Amino acid sequence: GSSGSSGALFHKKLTEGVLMRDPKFLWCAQCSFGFIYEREQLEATCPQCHQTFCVRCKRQWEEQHRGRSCEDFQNWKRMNSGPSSG
Ligand SMILES: [Zn+2]
């Protein structure tokens, strides 16, 4: 037997006059400011709280997080900051 099925105009069609779709809505997790960052980094800073927080897990950034991901980072917290992080 066999399977498979793929086909869309999103292959050889370039975007045109498309300014409706939203880029990246990055905001705090408490104040929920609301500002676009669409940046290639994980060191976002709120224009109000001025607190560095990840743009993915939306958690208090950490030097250890740098280079790693929300997943790997967490594992480091449970290991380093014991089973119960303060
Ligand atoms: Zn904020």
Ligand SMILES: [Zn+2]
């Ligand atoms: Zn993260």
